[PDB]
Tab-separated table of C-alpha atoms and ligand atoms in Angstrom:
chain	number	residue	atom	x	y	z
J	1226	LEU	CA	86.856	117.613	87.344
J	1227	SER	CA	90.561	116.410	87.682
J	1228	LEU	CA	91.030	115.601	91.284
J	1229	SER	CA	93.833	114.398	93.597
J	1230	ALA	CA	94.119	110.919	95.025
J	1231	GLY	CA	96.357	108.175	96.240
J	1232	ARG	CA	98.096	107.585	99.390
J	1233	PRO	CA	100.659	110.426	99.526
J	1234	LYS	CA	97.975	112.540	97.715
J	1235	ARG	CA	99.395	112.856	94.065
J	1236	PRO	CA	97.599	115.032	91.592
J	1237	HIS	CA	95.747	114.141	88.640
J	1238	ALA	CA	94.846	110.800	89.827
J	1239	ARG	CA	90.895	110.621	89.818
J	1240	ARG	CA	89.037	112.200	87.038
J	1241	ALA	CA	85.197	112.509	87.751
J	1242	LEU	CA	82.232	114.288	86.490
J	1243	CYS	CA	79.912	115.227	89.209
J	1244	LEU	CA	80.971	116.972	92.493
J	1245	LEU	CA	80.152	115.165	95.867
J	1246	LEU	CA	79.613	117.693	98.757
J	1247	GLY	CA	78.938	115.621	101.491
J	1248	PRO	CA	80.569	115.038	105.026
J	1249	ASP	CA	83.213	112.629	103.522
J	1250	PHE	CA	86.945	112.508	104.471
J	1251	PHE	CA	90.256	112.102	102.969
J	1252	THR	CA	93.381	110.939	104.417
J	1253	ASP	CA	96.988	112.221	103.810
J	1254	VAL	CA	100.481	111.205	104.783
J	1255	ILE	CA	102.790	114.027	105.998
J	1256	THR	CA	106.479	113.647	106.436
J	1257	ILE	CA	107.568	116.508	109.203
J	1258	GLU	CA	110.681	117.160	111.130
J	1259	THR	CA	110.781	118.899	114.688
J	1260	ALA	CA	113.009	121.331	116.249
J	1261	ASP	CA	115.236	118.372	117.534
J	1262	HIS	CA	115.569	117.523	113.838
J	1263	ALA	CA	113.462	114.296	114.332
J	1264	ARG	CA	112.030	113.339	110.888
J	1265	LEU	CA	108.764	111.513	111.569
J	1266	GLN	CA	105.604	110.822	109.190
J	1267	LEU	CA	102.079	111.162	109.982
J	1268	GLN	CA	98.787	109.834	108.915
J	1269	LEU	CA	95.831	112.260	109.185
J	1270	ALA	CA	92.111	112.375	108.438
J	1271	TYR	CA	90.176	115.467	107.247
J	1272	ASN	CA	86.351	115.769	107.858
J	1273	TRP	CA	85.127	118.175	105.115
J	1274	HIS	CA	81.917	119.229	103.400
F	54	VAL	CA	86.296	136.644	51.644
F	55	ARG	CA	83.999	136.422	54.555
F	56	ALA	CA	82.386	134.046	57.111
F	57	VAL	CA	78.728	132.954	56.588
F	58	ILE	CA	77.575	131.336	60.060
F	59	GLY	CA	74.119	130.114	61.164
F	60	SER	CA	71.553	128.736	58.620
F	61	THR	CA	72.268	126.586	55.746
F	62	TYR	CA	73.793	128.046	52.823
F	63	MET	CA	73.970	127.434	49.079
F	64	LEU	CA	77.046	129.107	47.333
F	65	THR	CA	75.515	131.703	44.856
F	66	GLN	CA	77.044	132.407	41.603
F	67	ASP	CA	80.446	133.872	41.729
F	68	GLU	CA	81.105	132.365	45.136
F	69	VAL	CA	83.779	129.647	46.099
F	70	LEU	CA	85.107	128.037	49.211
F	71	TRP	CA	88.097	129.862	50.776
F	72	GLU	CA	90.509	127.809	52.783
F	73	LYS	CA	91.695	129.130	56.100
F	74	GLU	CA	95.148	127.971	57.139
F	75	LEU	CA	96.599	128.499	60.638
F	76	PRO	CA	100.091	129.131	61.884
F	77	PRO	CA	102.004	125.901	62.684
F	78	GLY	CA	101.278	124.267	66.090
F	79	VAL	CA	97.952	125.903	66.448
F	80	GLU	CA	96.271	122.967	64.932
F	81	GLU	CA	98.119	120.865	67.418
F	82	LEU	CA	96.475	123.092	70.242
F	83	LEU	CA	93.041	122.746	68.608
F	84	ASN	CA	92.752	118.969	68.085
F	85	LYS	CA	94.592	117.686	70.960
F	86	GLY	CA	93.959	120.157	73.845
F	87	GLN	CA	90.249	120.009	74.451
F	88	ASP	CA	89.569	121.248	77.993
F	89	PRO	CA	92.520	122.935	79.557
F	90	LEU	CA	90.783	122.737	82.721
F	91	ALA	CA	90.286	119.137	82.356
F	92	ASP	CA	93.709	117.855	80.739
F	93	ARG	CA	95.989	120.784	81.934
F	94	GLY	CA	98.109	118.205	83.703
F	95	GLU	CA	100.279	117.467	80.683
P	730	NAD	N1	81.410	110.331	106.706
P	730	NAD	C1	82.309	109.583	106.325
P	730	NAD	O1	83.067	109.181	107.180
P	730	NAD	C2	82.489	109.013	104.943
P	730	NAD	C3	81.404	109.255	104.060
P	730	NAD	C4	81.224	108.738	102.931
P	730	NAD	C5	82.536	108.087	102.414
P	730	NAD	N2	83.587	107.899	103.212
P	730	NAD	C6	84.820	107.185	102.657
P	730	NAD	O2	85.979	107.603	103.400
P	730	NAD	C7	87.005	107.180	102.503
P	730	NAD	C8	88.446	107.877	102.819
P	730	NAD	O3	89.477	107.292	101.939
P	730	NAD	P1	90.483	108.277	101.270
P	730	NAD	O4	90.033	109.829	101.310
P	730	NAD	O5	91.903	108.074	101.978
P	730	NAD	O6	90.716	107.892	99.860
P	730	NAD	P2	91.085	108.943	98.750
P	730	NAD	O7	92.210	109.658	99.302
P	730	NAD	O8	91.280	107.922	97.534
P	730	NAD	O9	89.862	109.598	98.457
P	730	NAD	C9	89.726	110.861	97.911
P	730	NAD	C10	88.469	111.660	98.414
P	730	NAD	O10	88.041	112.464	97.396
P	730	NAD	C11	86.514	112.491	97.540
P	730	NAD	N3	85.792	112.337	96.158
P	730	NAD	C12	85.974	111.569	95.016
P	730	NAD	N4	85.365	111.834	94.119
P	730	NAD	C13	84.688	112.984	94.334
P	730	NAD	C14	83.620	113.832	93.756
P	730	NAD	N5	83.225	113.469	92.392
P	730	NAD	N6	83.163	114.842	94.213
P	730	NAD	C15	83.463	115.089	95.516
P	730	NAD	N7	84.438	114.389	96.155
P	730	NAD	C16	84.995	113.128	95.616
P	730	NAD	C17	85.978	111.142	98.355
P	730	NAD	O11	85.155	111.343	99.159
P	730	NAD	C18	87.316	110.836	98.980
P	730	NAD	O12	87.287	111.295	100.416
P	730	NAD	C19	86.454	107.515	101.271
P	730	NAD	O13	86.987	106.702	100.132
P	730	NAD	C20	85.086	107.651	101.200
P	730	NAD	O14	84.283	106.696	100.395
P	730	NAD	C21	83.634	108.379	104.514
């Protein structure tokens, strides 16, 4: 499995062999912009299983 | 010419080995790119 990793979540950054399907999380950095044109970046955290 | 696949084989009388050539670039796809689900990145 060729997966994604890193701080802005680049692709092809962590090759692995088994699939972990547990309640982990991964964190991403999202740059967005509002209706007032305020550019601002986020840090989120994603509980998945 | 045919393909004999499976068990071990001794060439009988009047049989020789044939060479299968491939179009250019196809050998580069066979040896380099092993698993296109794996290394499809490049
Ligand atoms: N329940 C929890 O809160 C919990 C449980 C286990 C681990 N964690 C840790 O939280 C950290 C969050 O950091 P991050 O996500 O910013 O780092 P990251 O973005 O580098 O992590 C990438 C994510 O991919 C997942 N992953 C990696 N190899 C895997 C495989 N073979 N199969 C399935 N999933 C795979 C990891 O769980 C990780 O969350 C992880 O490094 C993880 O070890 C949290």
